[PDB]
Amino acid sequence: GNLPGLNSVQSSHARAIIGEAKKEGVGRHGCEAGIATALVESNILIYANKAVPASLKYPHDAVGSDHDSVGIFQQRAKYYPNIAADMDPARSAAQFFAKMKGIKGWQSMAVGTLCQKVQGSAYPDRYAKRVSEATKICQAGGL
Ligand SMILES: [Zn+2]
Ligand SMILES: [Zn+2]
């Protein structure tokens, strides 16, 4: 059925993230970072943004108005110009994991801090508060 604490939509999205974690070989630690980030930024839903016209032309579970942030990871269109990718769970995850891997020391870095660095966020506390669930969800997905 569904993953721990996720409805069927969130579950679908998380499975796509977890699947890309396997493909990219980031292990549970990587998966924890991806899911924890997804929970904070969007609660694992695909957001569009009025501020980015092209994003309304892709399937989305809701609309938000944070900067030019789009998708599950709230990747800024400024920096991530391919909106198709930003609005696709698997491809958007690949974009997260790609940046995460370029961070020297990520494999043994605390998850909260790792998400902060990847997202350019100002506080790790938000992501850290979500790791317990991210683990449960990653485990249930096969990582
Ligand atoms: Zn870990
Ligand atoms: Zn700003």
PDB file of C-alpha atoms and ligand atoms in Angstrom:
ATOM      1  CA  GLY A   1       0.000   0.000   0.000  1.00  0.00           C
ATOM      2  CA  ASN A   2       1.372   3.346   1.189  1.00  0.00           C
ATOM      3  CA  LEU A   3       4.640   4.328   2.905  1.00  0.00           C
ATOM      4  CA  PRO A   4       4.738   5.354   6.634  1.00  0.00           C
ATOM      5  CA  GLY A   5       2.614   8.475   7.129  1.00  0.00           C
ATOM      6  CA  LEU A   6       2.213   9.181   3.393  1.00  0.00           C
ATOM      7  CA  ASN A   7      -0.946   9.127   1.269  1.00  0.00           C
ATOM      8  CA  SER A   8      -0.880   7.447  -2.155  1.00  0.00           C
ATOM      9  CA  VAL A   9       0.364  10.603  -3.923  1.00  0.00           C
ATOM     10  CA  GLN A  10       3.187  11.314  -1.469  1.00  0.00           C
ATOM     11  CA  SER A  11       3.990   7.569  -1.565  1.00  0.00           C
ATOM     12  CA  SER A  12       4.191   7.590  -5.365  1.00  0.00           C
ATOM     13  CA  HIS A  13       6.505  10.633  -5.282  1.00  0.00           C
ATOM     14  CA  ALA A  14       8.723   9.165  -2.531  1.00  0.00           C
ATOM     15  CA  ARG A  15       9.021   5.840  -4.411  1.00  0.00           C
ATOM     16  CA  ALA A  16      10.336   7.833  -7.399  1.00  0.00           C
ATOM     17  CA  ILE A  17      12.869   9.627  -5.186  1.00  0.00           C
ATOM     18  CA  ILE A  18      13.931   6.388  -3.461  1.00  0.00           C
ATOM     19  CA  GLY A  19      14.222   4.730  -6.892  1.00  0.00           C
ATOM     20  CA  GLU A  20      16.583   7.494  -8.055  1.00  0.00           C
ATOM     21  CA  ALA A  21      18.557   7.117  -4.791  1.00  0.00           C
ATOM     22  CA  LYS A  22      19.133   3.461  -5.707  1.00  0.00           C
ATOM     23  CA  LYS A  23      20.107   4.350  -9.267  1.00  0.00           C
ATOM     24  CA  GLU A  24      22.573   7.023  -8.071  1.00  0.00           C
ATOM     25  CA  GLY A  25      23.908   4.797  -5.284  1.00  0.00           C
ATOM     26  CA  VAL A  26      23.637   7.315  -2.436  1.00  0.00           C
ATOM     27  CA  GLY A  27      22.490   4.646   0.051  1.00  0.00           C
ATOM     28  CA  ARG A  28      20.143   5.243   2.986  1.00  0.00           C
ATOM     29  CA  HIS A  29      22.081   8.329   4.050  1.00  0.00           C
ATOM     30  CA  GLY A  30      21.479   9.950   0.650  1.00  0.00           C
ATOM     31  CA  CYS A  31      17.849   8.783   0.631  1.00  0.00           C
ATOM     32  CA  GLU A  32      17.353  10.251   4.139  1.00  0.00           C
ATOM     33  CA  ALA A  33      18.603  13.611   2.825  1.00  0.00           C
ATOM     34  CA  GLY A  34      16.290  13.505  -0.204  1.00  0.00           C
ATOM     35  CA  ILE A  35      13.125  12.531   1.677  1.00  0.00           C
ATOM     36  CA  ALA A  36      13.843  14.833   4.625  1.00  0.00           C
ATOM     37  CA  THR A  37      14.329  17.732   2.188  1.00  0.00           C
ATOM     38  CA  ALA A  38      11.142  16.808   0.301  1.00  0.00           C
ATOM     39  CA  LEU A  39       9.130  16.762   3.560  1.00  0.00           C
ATOM     40  CA  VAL A  40      10.360  20.226   4.610  1.00  0.00           C
ATOM     41  CA  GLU A  41      10.078  22.006   1.255  1.00  0.00           C
ATOM     42  CA  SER A  42       6.765  20.586  -0.008  1.00  0.00           C
ATOM     43  CA  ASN A  43       5.579  17.669   2.182  1.00  0.00           C
ATOM     44  CA  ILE A  44       6.468  15.586  -0.912  1.00  0.00           C
ATOM     45  CA  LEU A  45       4.104  17.240  -3.397  1.00  0.00           C
ATOM     46  CA  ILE A  46       4.758  18.819  -6.801  1.00  0.00           C
ATOM     47  CA  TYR A  47       4.267  22.592  -6.455  1.00  0.00           C
ATOM     48  CA  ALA A  48       3.872  24.995  -9.351  1.00  0.00           C
ATOM     49  CA  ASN A  49       4.381  28.756  -9.023  1.00  0.00           C
ATOM     50  CA  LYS A  50       2.402  31.638 -10.587  1.00  0.00           C
ATOM     51  CA  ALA A  51       5.820  33.357 -10.710  1.00  0.00           C
ATOM     52  CA  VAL A  52       7.037  30.696 -13.208  1.00  0.00           C
ATOM     53  CA  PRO A  53       4.401  30.531 -16.016  1.00  0.00           C
ATOM     54  CA  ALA A  54       5.797  27.321 -17.535  1.00  0.00           C
ATOM     55  CA  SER A  55       5.308  25.376 -14.265  1.00  0.00           C
ATOM     56  CA  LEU A  56       1.499  25.622 -14.449  1.00  0.00           C
ATOM     57  CA  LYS A  57       1.661  23.567 -17.668  1.00  0.00           C
ATOM     58  CA  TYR A  58       3.012  20.516 -15.792  1.00  0.00           C
ATOM     59  CA  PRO A  59       1.000  18.180 -13.493  1.00  0.00           C
ATOM     60  CA  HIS A  60       1.095  19.497  -9.940  1.00  0.00           C
ATOM     61  CA  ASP A  61      -0.509  18.712  -6.607  1.00  0.00           C
ATOM     62  CA  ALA A  62      -0.625  22.391  -5.541  1.00  0.00           C
ATOM     63  CA  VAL A  63       0.560  25.961  -6.216  1.00  0.00           C
ATOM     64  CA  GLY A  64       2.968  28.024  -4.106  1.00  0.00           C
ATOM     65  CA  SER A  65       4.600  31.462  -4.309  1.00  0.00           C
ATOM     66  CA  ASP A  66       8.074  31.085  -2.776  1.00  0.00           C
ATOM     67  CA  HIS A  67      10.515  32.970  -5.045  1.00  0.00           C
ATOM     68  CA  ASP A  68      10.690  31.078  -8.350  1.00  0.00           C
ATOM     69  CA  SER A  69      10.716  27.773  -6.428  1.00  0.00           C
ATOM     70  CA  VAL A  70       9.118  24.790  -8.186  1.00  0.00           C
ATOM     71  CA  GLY A  71       8.689  21.068  -7.617  1.00  0.00           C
ATOM     72  CA  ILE A  72       9.102  18.830  -4.565  1.00  0.00           C
ATOM     73  CA  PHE A  73      12.557  20.275  -3.822  1.00  0.00           C
ATOM     74  CA  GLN A  74      11.506  23.893  -4.462  1.00  0.00           C
ATOM     75  CA  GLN A  75      14.382  24.194  -6.920  1.00  0.00           C
ATOM     76  CA  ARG A  76      14.631  27.795  -8.118  1.00  0.00           C
ATOM     77  CA  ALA A  77      13.997  28.207 -11.858  1.00  0.00           C
ATOM     78  CA  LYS A  78      16.749  30.850 -11.924  1.00  0.00           C
ATOM     79  CA  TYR A  79      19.308  28.147 -11.086  1.00  0.00           C
ATOM     80  CA  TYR A  80      17.373  25.144 -12.482  1.00  0.00           C
ATOM     81  CA  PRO A  81      15.965  26.375 -15.827  1.00  0.00           C
ATOM     82  CA  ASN A  82      14.625  22.997 -17.045  1.00  0.00           C
ATOM     83  CA  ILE A  83      11.093  23.086 -15.608  1.00  0.00           C
ATOM     84  CA  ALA A  84      10.124  19.651 -16.959  1.00  0.00           C
ATOM     85  CA  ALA A  85      12.897  18.180 -14.792  1.00  0.00           C
ATOM     86  CA  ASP A  86      12.012  20.333 -11.775  1.00  0.00           C
ATOM     87  CA  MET A  87       8.368  19.185 -11.968  1.00  0.00           C
ATOM     88  CA  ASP A  88       9.248  15.476 -12.420  1.00  0.00           C
ATOM     89  CA  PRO A  89       9.947  13.653  -9.082  1.00  0.00           C
ATOM     90  CA  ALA A  90      12.642  11.299 -10.422  1.00  0.00           C
ATOM     91  CA  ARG A  91      14.461  13.970 -12.452  1.00  0.00           C
ATOM     92  CA  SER A  92      14.144  16.595  -9.704  1.00  0.00           C
ATOM     93  CA  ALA A  93      15.595  14.040  -7.249  1.00  0.00           C
ATOM     94  CA  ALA A  94      18.481  13.379  -9.668  1.00  0.00           C
ATOM     95  CA  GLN A  95      19.157  17.146  -9.576  1.00  0.00           C
ATOM     96  CA  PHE A  96      19.192  17.102  -5.751  1.00  0.00           C
ATOM     97  CA  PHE A  97      21.431  14.016  -5.529  1.00  0.00           C
ATOM     98  CA  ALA A  98      23.808  15.444  -8.152  1.00  0.00           C
ATOM     99  CA  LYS A  99      24.409  18.549  -6.030  1.00  0.00           C
ATOM    100  CA  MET A 100      24.549  16.527  -2.788  1.00  0.00           C
ATOM    101  CA  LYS A 101      27.341  14.337  -4.232  1.00  0.00           C
ATOM    102  CA  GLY A 102      29.464  17.401  -5.096  1.00  0.00           C
ATOM    103  CA  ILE A 103      29.538  18.318  -1.384  1.00  0.00           C
ATOM    104  CA  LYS A 104      32.835  16.994  -0.009  1.00  0.00           C
ATOM    105  CA  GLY A 105      32.144  14.929   3.140  1.00  0.00           C
ATOM    106  CA  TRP A 106      28.426  14.303   2.539  1.00  0.00           C
ATOM    107  CA  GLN A 107      28.594  10.550   3.286  1.00  0.00           C
ATOM    108  CA  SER A 108      29.367  11.063   7.000  1.00  0.00           C
ATOM    109  CA  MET A 109      27.796  14.535   7.342  1.00  0.00           C
ATOM    110  CA  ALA A 110      24.721  14.980   9.558  1.00  0.00           C
ATOM    111  CA  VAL A 111      21.560  14.882   7.422  1.00  0.00           C
ATOM    112  CA  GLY A 112      20.188  18.236   8.607  1.00  0.00           C
ATOM    113  CA  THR A 113      23.408  20.039   7.664  1.00  0.00           C
ATOM    114  CA  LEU A 114      23.650  18.169   4.342  1.00  0.00           C
ATOM    115  CA  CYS A 115      20.149  19.279   3.286  1.00  0.00           C
ATOM    116  CA  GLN A 116      20.930  22.849   4.369  1.00  0.00           C
ATOM    117  CA  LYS A 117      24.037  22.936   2.163  1.00  0.00           C
ATOM    118  CA  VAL A 118      22.262  21.377  -0.829  1.00  0.00           C
ATOM    119  CA  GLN A 119      19.236  23.678  -0.563  1.00  0.00           C
ATOM    120  CA  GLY A 120      21.166  26.817   0.443  1.00  0.00           C
ATOM    121  CA  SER A 121      18.823  27.011   3.458  1.00  0.00           C
ATOM    122  CA  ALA A 122      19.644  29.122   6.516  1.00  0.00           C
ATOM    123  CA  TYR A 123      18.810  26.530   9.210  1.00  0.00           C
ATOM    124  CA  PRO A 124      19.395  22.735   9.402  1.00  0.00           C
ATOM    125  CA  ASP A 125      17.003  22.279  12.354  1.00  0.00           C
ATOM    126  CA  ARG A 126      13.961  21.994  10.068  1.00  0.00           C
ATOM    127  CA  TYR A 127      15.407  19.112   8.047  1.00  0.00           C
ATOM    128  CA  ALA A 128      16.860  17.380  11.133  1.00  0.00           C
ATOM    129  CA  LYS A 129      13.405  17.365  12.767  1.00  0.00           C
ATOM    130  CA  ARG A 130      12.221  15.171   9.843  1.00  0.00           C
ATOM    131  CA  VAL A 131      14.974  12.516   9.656  1.00  0.00           C
ATOM    132  CA  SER A 132      13.253   9.924  11.870  1.00  0.00           C
ATOM    133  CA  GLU A 133      10.371   9.841   9.372  1.00  0.00           C
ATOM    134  CA  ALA A 134      12.732   9.926   6.375  1.00  0.00           C
ATOM    135  CA  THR A 135      14.502   6.811   7.686  1.00  0.00           C
ATOM    136  CA  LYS A 136      11.201   4.970   8.253  1.00  0.00           C
ATOM    137  CA  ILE A 137      10.162   5.934   4.711  1.00  0.00           C
ATOM    138  CA  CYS A 138      13.497   5.052   3.090  1.00  0.00           C
ATOM    139  CA  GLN A 139      13.557   1.669   4.857  1.00  0.00           C
ATOM    140  CA  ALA A 140       9.979   0.887   3.791  1.00  0.00           C
ATOM    141  CA  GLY A 141      10.957   1.752   0.192  1.00  0.00           C
ATOM    142  CA  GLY A 142      13.860  -0.734   0.206  1.00  0.00           C
ATOM    143  CA  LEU A 143      16.764   1.495   1.362  1.00  0.00           C
TER     144      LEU A 143
HETATM  145 ZN    ZN B   1      22.084   8.624   7.774  1.00  0.00          ZN
HETATM  146 ZN    ZN B   2      14.858  35.681  -1.591  1.00  0.00          ZN
END
